[PDB]
Amino acid sequence: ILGKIWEGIKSLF
């Protein structure tokens, strides 16, 4: 996972 917290960020927008 190169961005676990990013997975949700890209999902918000």
Residue from 10, 12, 13 nearest 1 by CA: 10
DSSP H or E stretch at residue 7 = helix 4-12
The 8-class DSSP code of residue 13 comes to: -
In angstroms, the Cα distances linking 12 to 1, 2, 3, 4 are: 18, 18, 14, 14
In angstroms, the Cα distances linking 11 to 5, 6 are: 10, 8
In angstroms, the Cα distances linking 1 to 5, 10, 12 are: 10, 14, 18
User: Which residues contact residue 7 at a Cβ distance below 8 angstroms, ignoring those fewer than 6 apart?
Assistant: 1
